[PDB]
Amino acid sequence: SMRKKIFKPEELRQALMPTLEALYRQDPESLPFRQPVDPQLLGIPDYFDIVKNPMDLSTIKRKLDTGQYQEPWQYVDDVWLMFNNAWLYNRKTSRVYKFCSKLAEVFEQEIDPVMQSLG
Ligand SMILES: CCOc1ccc(C(C)=O)cc1Nc1cc(C(=O)OC)cc(C(=O)OC)c1
Secondary structure, three states, X not given: OOOOOOOXXXXXXXXXXXXXXXXXXXXXXXXXXXXXXXXXXXXXXXXXXHOOOOOOHXXXXXXXXOOOOOOHHHHHHHHHHHHHHHHHHOOOOOHHHHHHHHHHHHHHHHHHHHHHHHO
């Protein structure tokens, strides 16, 4: 333990992929988040005028799958970035905003004990 703590990609995937899978299993709530927002195809062309750092579940999954995170908190940051983009762009009356609120509740439930045990 008198060593710099390193999280190998496989350790991050084993600990963190279950928390991402818990989001994917929310149907329909994860549906708006499973792929990058395409503003033209979705009919929301000003999206990138508001959301400067887009994020979605498939991008997070690819980063875990390819070892692009060095520390667990970087994964957690990307999940919150995805949620905060949706709460910034969508109105409280919209289904996407309500779905985002549900996903964030699920994430908070799953992530806290996982981060505690990761150390
Ligand atoms: C039409 C407005 O779409 C959006 C608006 C905003 C955002 C964000 C992340 O700020 C994302 C979407 N995209 C999206 C929405 C829904 C949906 O409302 O399902 C009930 C389903 C899918 C999908 O591919 O389901 C397979 C994709």
